[PDB]
Amino acid sequence: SMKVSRDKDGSKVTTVVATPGQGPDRPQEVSYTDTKVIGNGSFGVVYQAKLCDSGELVAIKKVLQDKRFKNRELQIMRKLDHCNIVRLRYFFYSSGEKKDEVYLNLVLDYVPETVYRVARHYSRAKQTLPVIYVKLYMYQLFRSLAYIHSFGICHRDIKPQNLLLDPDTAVLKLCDFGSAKQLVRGEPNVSYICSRYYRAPELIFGATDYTSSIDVWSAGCVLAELLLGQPIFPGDSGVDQLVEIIKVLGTPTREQIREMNPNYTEFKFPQIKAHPWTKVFRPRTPPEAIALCSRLLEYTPTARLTPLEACAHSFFDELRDPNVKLPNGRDTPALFNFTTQELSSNPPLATILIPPHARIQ
Amino acid sequence: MKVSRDKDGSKVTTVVATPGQGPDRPQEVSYTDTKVIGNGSFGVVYQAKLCDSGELVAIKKVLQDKRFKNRELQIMRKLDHCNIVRLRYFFYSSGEKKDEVYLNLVLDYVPETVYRVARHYSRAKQTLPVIYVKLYMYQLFRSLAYIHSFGICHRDIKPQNLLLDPDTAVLKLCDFGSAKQLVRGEPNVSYICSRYYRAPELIFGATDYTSSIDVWSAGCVLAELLLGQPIFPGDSGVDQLVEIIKVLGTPTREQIREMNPNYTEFKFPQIKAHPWTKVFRPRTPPEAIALCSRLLEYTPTARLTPLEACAHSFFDELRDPNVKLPNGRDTPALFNFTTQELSSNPPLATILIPPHAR
Ligand SMILES: O=C(NCCCN1CCN(c2cccc(Cl)c2Cl)CC1)n1c(=O)[nH]c2ccc(-c3cccnc3)cc21
Ligand SMILES: O=C(NCCCN1CCN(c2cccc(Cl)c2Cl)CC1)n1c(=O)[nH]c2ccc(-c3cccnc3)cc21
């Protein structure tokens, strides 16, 4: 049930009764107006709306509700609370004319930009994003990956379109969990998740026993794309994607193929040596960024850095400097308020992750 | 290879190349006017002019593994069809720098592709006339019916790999770098075939697929030509599958088992079957929609064979004795079938060869 109405200057106003995303189930009277679509596709429509009272902008994701099982994205969104993940404020059910079908609406934070759009603005003008922003955007993404992985949840669709951005505050928030799923060892999972360009090689090889390290590969493809100005492993087919991976990483040894897809899909690749990673990027590319890419984009999934280990990489040392600031003068967003949940994968890493100045009493 | 010039300042290359569809007696071949016309993954595709007949040719240059023999070459020397690009010659040469051997494939030159022609009508906000949809689709099925009779699967049917001569309306299939003979019992990789056109059993990661993946990809080209845009788009397999469910409906558990037996352990939203007639524009011929529904089937064994598609009622206008091209010329070769081409279903010759043919 929803109650449509108007204000007194015009302005159509919708009022729903929604459940808080987190906390106890205390129903909520939420009124919003100025509804405008901000893109759809597959899952459904994603709207933008303005809250009537406070005037804040929010996003509403409207998908079809399977009457059999409850929506998996909703069960995950309610378990999550992190500064680098888009927050589920409320959620409610509704319809739309007859249909006899139920729609699930997820009221989330609104963030005005995406990494895809920002990287495209710089790419169209023949230039790359300033490295300080690349450090800030990837650190916050690796922080969000270390959080959901602590719960065993794999995003399974890391791409620049799913990385929201506030340009003023440099805050990054991961969004779109319609492909996320808790990965339990011994259980199989579908191999056709994740978008092109960013699929881990074990996904291209059709493996079903993959771990959360596929998110680390996809995040590594985002970092290299921001450095190169174009996707590092493009291709319209899995064969084309693999060729671009062989071009950089080299031919995968037989033991590396076993770690990816143990099924051995029965293919023989051309033998190409290892592209020295320094030749892949621009001349003035920071070598620490090149070092991070090589440690994220590894054939062997267990050899890739964990999200928490990526945050502690030397490429992010500038963010731990006490005098670091955004170019526009403001302070950096919160980068060191780690929780025990966040550090559970490797608590001793807090000796590096939390700089001394972040502990000044 | 011996680089030289003419006498007007043109630069001419002469190599000793082996005829593709011959015994094995190399000749001296000279070409000029070399220009890049394609690149990516495999290598570079050049265009050249034969110094004798002035005939335009395409040279596909790829790197050669010294271990095994290039599988594309071994397939090309076996093929001889009017709707498949012809391997005129092939030769080896150096390049790059680390003493690496390069294989060069001298093929036919066809000036246009289905992708580029369709992209023009899409930009101009119109649809390709159905007569051209008939001619292009028919010749593509004829090419698939040929290679499938050898057990060869193209595994990459897409409009970019469908060359077109606009004046003669001749279609020629090209790009066999993914082609492979599919033998029952042997597994084959599931990461072949380009996006938008991958068969559903490929998205499910099945390794026991048959030649019917080309038929699905063919059906995706037919739907795209009728719509003016891809019918099953998506940057991921989940997105591609959802667009398929919206048209075909939720596949029954029987259809899931026939697609990928492993059952990838996923549950899909229960969407009813979109009426095929509501997918296309109102003026779309019903015979075209009928052919699409018989190509884009969940169960791979339920899809039409390439030969059965050539005999579909959608191509009846092509068998009319008074059909002509919009530019006035006659239709190209459409009925010069061979015994090998019809081996899948010989009784179909009564329909495929109209009474007025030879
Ligand atoms: O996407 C967001 N913001 C984008 C900024 C505004 N842009 C959209 C409108 N526009 C635009 C875009 C393209 C072309 C044109 Cl011509 C135009 Cl005008 C300008 C740019 N989200 C946000 O803020 N909270 C969210 C919560 C969940 C999801 C989400 C997305 C996908 C799947 N599931 C959930 C997305 C957002
Ligand atoms: O592709 C072919 N013809 C079409 C070339 C496409 N364009 C034509 C002209 N043109 C262009 C023209 C006007 C404006 C603009 Cl703006 C432009 Cl760009 C530029 C190019 N092939 C051909 O004739 N024989 C082949 C043999 C093998 C392969 C092949 C391709 C991929 C993998 N393996 C084999 C391709 C051809």
XYZ file of C-alpha atoms in Angstrom, chain A residues 41-43 64 66 68-69 72 101 156-157 159 161 178-179 181 188-196 199 204-206 208 234 236-244 247 263-273, chain B residues 40-42 63 65 67-68 71 98 100 155-156 158 160 177-178 180 187-195 198 203-205 207 233-243 246 262 264-271:
104
model
C 18.148 -2.893 -16.904
C 17.613 -6.570 -16.129
C 16.772 -6.315 -12.424
C 10.218 -8.033 -8.929
C 9.548 -13.683 -6.089
C 8.560 -18.142 -3.209
C 11.753 -17.080 -1.421
C 18.609 -12.473 -1.407
C 2.887 -9.197 -8.917
C 30.586 -11.142 -7.723
C 30.119 -8.025 -9.892
C 32.885 -2.884 -11.988
C 29.482 1.255 -12.833
C 22.004 -8.277 -6.895
C 24.773 -10.788 -7.649
C 26.089 -14.478 -2.345
C 29.101 -24.880 -6.086
C 28.294 -21.477 -7.549
C 27.320 -20.280 -11.013
C 30.168 -19.263 -13.321
C 28.252 -16.740 -15.464
C 28.228 -13.932 -12.881
C 30.445 -10.821 -13.095
C 30.652 -8.512 -16.107
C 33.009 -8.729 -19.068
C 35.881 -11.612 -14.869
C 36.153 -17.552 -17.824
C 37.276 -21.169 -17.387
C 33.793 -22.021 -16.089
C 32.283 -23.402 -9.821
C 38.998 -6.206 -23.127
C 33.940 -9.653 -26.854
C 34.485 -13.354 -26.074
C 36.209 -15.360 -23.376
C 38.926 -16.290 -25.868
C 39.691 -12.630 -26.580
C 39.803 -11.839 -22.857
C 42.215 -14.707 -22.172
C 44.531 -13.584 -24.991
C 44.825 -10.137 -23.399
C 49.724 -10.874 -23.221
C 38.470 -29.426 -14.693
C 41.061 -28.470 -17.332
C 38.721 -27.271 -20.108
C 41.058 -28.910 -22.703
C 42.506 -25.947 -24.589
C 46.042 -25.093 -25.695
C 47.136 -21.448 -25.697
C 49.963 -19.803 -27.650
C 53.182 -19.558 -25.646
C 53.949 -15.903 -24.853
C 56.468 -14.694 -22.275
C 42.884 -7.491 -32.314
C 43.672 -10.719 -30.443
C 44.786 -12.995 -33.285
C 51.811 -15.738 -34.935
C 53.209 -21.853 -32.667
C 54.635 -26.884 -31.647
C 51.335 -27.796 -33.304
C 44.049 -25.184 -36.498
C 62.243 -12.180 -31.707
C 58.993 -15.383 -34.489
C 31.676 -21.270 -32.572
C 31.767 -17.514 -33.296
C 28.366 -12.823 -35.275
C 31.270 -8.938 -37.782
C 40.090 -18.980 -35.543
C 37.591 -20.534 -33.115
C 36.798 -26.902 -34.195
C 34.814 -31.930 -24.094
C 35.216 -28.475 -25.595
C 35.775 -25.097 -23.975
C 32.711 -23.076 -22.988
C 34.332 -19.623 -23.291
C 34.038 -19.394 -27.087
C 31.452 -17.314 -29.001
C 30.978 -13.564 -28.571
C 28.529 -11.800 -26.266
C 26.286 -17.073 -27.006
C 26.428 -19.377 -20.590
C 25.779 -22.311 -18.244
C 29.359 -23.463 -18.876
C 31.283 -28.573 -22.298
C 22.131 -7.895 -24.693
C 24.019 -7.853 -21.421
C 27.515 -7.334 -20.032
C 27.283 -10.519 -17.932
C 25.824 -13.987 -18.284
C 23.189 -13.114 -15.684
C 22.086 -10.101 -17.733
C 22.105 -12.111 -20.973
C 20.074 -14.919 -19.392
C 17.477 -12.516 -17.966
C 16.874 -11.008 -21.410
C 11.944 -12.307 -20.832
C 25.398 -30.309 -14.182
C 24.661 -24.769 -12.176
C 22.493 -24.498 -9.021
C 20.588 -21.281 -9.702
C 16.946 -20.243 -9.390
C 15.485 -17.815 -11.922
C 12.430 -15.531 -11.706
C 9.287 -17.192 -13.055
C 8.424 -15.103 -16.127
